[PDB]
């Protein structure tokens, strides 16, 4: 069982829970929207490829990251032993491994600003596709405008930086989990830095289409 | 939309997400367990009452709290008229309301110690229980000994305190939400302290059996 | 309605009318320029961040302000039940609320002279961004040189100090609106004082530009 | 551009912004009301003549004025060759020309209180014209009671006297704009003085209406 | 031959010359526009009837009025005799006769505001007719927008009042032409008065469609 | 559009219309007569020169003047941006320009007396002329003895004076057009006075033959 002054436990709880919701969000694209693009064939196969090819492996990656965290957390709050209660009540080893793995996926995240760009390009010139968009954006699943979900990935990586930061603040240099978390932070940071151009470009694309619907 | 150096947005996301998982945790009792408990009738009707009586109302408060928060984070994350961005990119008001109305529920939590105690003494001097229990505890839904899902409700309250306090620390006094969050923190802190007694007895009851199984 | 020789009503109306215009002026940057900048991929992410990160929030502020001022002026201008006549026929409560709010935005205004120097620098050292400027400035929408729109936000704050001065000078201490207006003037004066350095820096910058643009 | 703390620039801009709005307010009568009045054949020719014969020319005047003020403000706000800087950065010549012109329009303003009483009279004694009013006042366009738009023209003239007062008070006798502004103030003051009777008649009329509209 | 201080001669010259141009204007409708409505069949036969049936007899009337004036004027400047130089150098007898005749035609003039109304109604709901209008309004013959010519008749009658007025001012009560001109004035006046409702309605219809194309 | 209590609009219409008829009057000489004069060659080439030489330039000035006025009345009568109504609903500027440049034509008018005199003495001691004349004077186009169309040019100048003076009287000094019209009036008045001598001799020459035919 966990101790109730252990901020680390709660940060892990937070990482896990915010990962589940992140993944449910990606499903708004990878499952539900796709279900609809397939029924309608409104999106050219090439552009469809462009979208799904740079989300699907991202989703697959997280699902594995989630699984490792879920497993650890259930040993953490579960009845542990003596020798095991040390390895069970930590999370930096897992975070370090997946933040490192992440460095391989930057390729896809970097493209999300093009994906959005091409989606908006095609969506303008094709009334049939626009129709499908309006229609899907009415479904309870699509709680934000669809193209807004395209920012959720890059934003998730920012959240990681945040979460790791708080971990490195809580742990003291003596701790069995300090070293791993500090390297983890370094890795997520390198990645957030590398995707800054793309995050800014994405952020600005979203502001523009929102602002343009709201002229004073 | 949501600002990235804006911690408050993330704490709000964190509040929302951990709320979702917490209700799932509850449903392990209020749904999948209740289901199995009728299909067996392996529990007294007055012991079954004593469980789902100090739990179901709590589930109902959280179901309500979850709705309000989810509804808001969606306004925050989504597009809005510019004159409205201030009203959506905040959460203190909702927290404070639900933290105040939480005190009207402390009664049920105080009785969690008994709920465990009287329940443990049940599965012990009973055969149909120890049998059904052992099998429920092998299902995917039950990732911890289901006895220990009874600590979850009071554990959650602790998380609120810790969460709200980070919020209060993020906001400069001139921000709109500073006022509300500070009151909300004061509120839940009052709740947790009243409940510190019940928390310890729960933690103790868990540690107790965790050792009777380790011999 | 308002009494026809009421100076407080006129200042209120002057605040409103001038707010609406200043907003449309911001839209030259926030919407129309940004549209072109994105379509042409002409600006480095970091510079685009510097610019819009310190304008976007300013625009949100003025939009909330305009919204409140507009409601009130219509209540003032329209028929009011006797018991609401005094509350509808004033502006100071709103000014005070917004002048206080503005304090939470000084950070952005403070970066404007920096945003400005960085733009010129980028334009001087990039034949393509320069071209995009030149072309944008030929659009009917951009009726002044783009960069001179960047001097408007801080100039608007000075205007506020001026307008509140007139109100404060107009009201006698007996009045419903006296205290709120004096409070508001104190607030905006605090803001302009904190921005004094940045203000004169922006003055000097424009004067150097219009002077350099025009040599014998 | 303008110097950022230039009070003359602010008054000029206040004149412009408030002129644009007042014009849109006149359009409620000249265009939108008139549209409905014609479609519904609700007003006797003679009354329709009384109304529009004394508004139509007023609108033409303000339109010419706005046109001149707009040109000038953009020249003021924009980059100017040194030799034109002084001519572009003033407003008094324009004010003086238009305040003089206004004298040729006092006849119309003078009939407004009469236009007003005659409308109310007609409305009281005609269930159909009354209905057309009631319905028009429900349109988003008519954001005040229609008749209260009729108090705006003479109120605008008072505003002019106010604005010129501030300019005159601001400029020192050395200034390029001093003489023209003082001349203009003299002109508008002549006009407001001649309309004094009609002004207070219009004040009294509104006060009686808003008071009668609202009895315990 | 005429005497060069005889203002009556010149007024007659003016009546004649302004009648010729009036008639050329009516031909813009009765000949040229009709030529085009017949080639295109864009206007329903009923509405065509409505237009031409209330112009054609008006035109026929003037043509006869013109003829009498033309004849008189050519005797006036022509070599007259002794007994004839008195009857030849006057015009009130002719003016009196035709202003009286005019009283019979008020029936048609009164309808011109309906004609215009119905033209605008049909022209909105029928793209084919609108097309023809745009097209015709490019021809050198159609120097004003076509529906503006529908005001020319009623305006011509006003001009008559003017012209007769000046005649009655010039002639002294002793003159062989005073009596006739004074009665003539009375008759044209009765008619102008009778068509006031329609003139106002026409005038206001024209203002509206012009103003609506020119919103500030 | 054009205002109805606005006299100026009407005087401008009157100016335009009477200008149209006056040019028609001229064309009775410069078109239909010139046509007949070639088809007969019944006039000296140096007498034909003397006519169309002191006339054609005048026709050319009026053709020009007519264009300017017509162009303007059309702006006046037609729709316009509101800020432009002041510039269209006026005519003094055009009048003044054409009244000034009229003085550079007074030369030709002074010679109208001779044009008639030398022309009358032509048709008198000639047979081919008196013959062609008599027949032209029976055509529809020639509603007055064509000799007397030579008074028309100077008569027109008088009309201008009378017309412009009504304008000056209509306008209050604060109207835009007051200035221009007042100068234009001063201008044509100068012209007419210089020409009063030539007018009288023309009128006299007409009255003279009008009596030789009445015996």
Swiss-Prot record, chains A, C, D, E:
Disulfide bonds: none annotated. Changing residue 199 to R: Increases guanyl-nucleotide exchange factor activity with RAC1. It comes from the Eukaryota. Induction: Up-regulated by TNFSF11. Changing residue 202 to Q: Increases guanyl-nucleotide exchange factor activity with RAC1. Detected in adult brain, lung and testis. Detected in embryonic hippocampus and brain cortex. Residues 7-198 form the DH domain. Interacts with PLXNA1. Interaction with PLXNA1 or PIP5K1C lowers its guanine nucleotide exchange activity. Dissociates from PLXNA1 when SEMA3A binds to the receptor. Interacts with PIP5K1C via its FERM domain. The interaction with PIP5K1C is enhanced by SEMA3A binding. Interacts with RAC1. Functions as a guanine nucleotide exchange factor that activates RAC1. May have relatively low activity. Plays a role in the response to class 3 semaphorins and remodeling of the actin cytoskeleton. Plays a role in TNFSF11-mediated osteoclast differentiation, especially in podosome rearrangement and reorganization of the actin cytoskeleton. Regulates the activation of ITGB3, integrin signaling and cell adhesion. Intramolecular interaction between the DH domain and the PH domains can stabilize the protein in an autoinhibited conformation. This is FERM, ARHGEF and pleckstrin domain-containing protein 2. The lineage of its organism: Eukaryota, Metazoa, Chordata, Craniata, Vertebrata. The chain holds residues 536 to 747 of 1065 of the full protein.
């Amino acid at each position: 069982g966990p101790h109730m002054e252990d901020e680390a436990y709660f940060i892990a709880k937070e990482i896990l829970a915010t990962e589940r919701t992140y993944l449910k969000d990606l499903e708004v694209i990878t499952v539900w929207f796709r279900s609809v693009l397939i029924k309608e064939e409104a999106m050219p196969a090439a552009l469809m490829a462009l979208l799904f090819s740079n989300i699907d492996p991202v989703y697959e990656f997280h699902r594995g990251f989630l699984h490792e965290v879920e497993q650890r957390l259930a040993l953490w709050e579960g009845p542990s032993s003596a020798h095991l209660k040390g390895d069970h009540q930590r999370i930096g080893d897992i975070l370090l491994r997946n933040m490192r793995q992440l460095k391989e996926f930057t390729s896809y995240f970097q493209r999300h600003d093009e994906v959005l760009t091409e989606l908006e390009k095609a969506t303008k010139h094709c009334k049939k596709l626009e129709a499908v968009y309006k229609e899907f954006e009415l479904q309870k699943v699509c709680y934000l405008p669809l193209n807004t979900f395209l920012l959720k990935p890059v934003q998730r990586l920012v959240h990681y930086r945040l979460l790791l930061s708080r971990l490195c603040a809580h742990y003291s240099p003596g701790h069995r989990d300090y070293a791993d978390c500090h390297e983890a932070l370094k890795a997520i940071t390198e990645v957030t830095t590398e995707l800054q151009q793309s995050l800014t470009r994405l952020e600005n694309l979203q502001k523009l289409t929102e602002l343009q619907r709201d002229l004073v």
